[PDB]
Amino acid sequence: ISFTNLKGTLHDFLRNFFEEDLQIRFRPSYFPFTEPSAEVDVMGKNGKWLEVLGCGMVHPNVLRNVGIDPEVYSGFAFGMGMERLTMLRYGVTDLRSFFENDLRFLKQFK
83 binds, among another protein, Mg ion, a second copy, none (CB under 5 to 8 A by kind): a second copy
Residue 100 annotated as part of some ligand binding site: no
Per CB under 8 A, the list member of 20, 25, 33, 81 interacting with another protein is: 25
Query: Please, what is the minimum distance in Å from the beta carbon of residue 67 to another protein?
Result: 19
Burial readout 46-82 (b: 16 or more C-beta within 10 A, e: otherwise): eeebeebbbbbbbbeebbeeeeeeeeeebbbbeebee
Q: Near Cl ion by CB under 5 A, which window of 32-40, 44-52, 53-61, 74-82?
A: 44-52
Per CB under 8 A, the list member of 16, 47, 48, 65 interacting with another protein is: 16
Cα distance between residue 39 and residue 28, in whole Å: 6
DSSP code, position 59: P
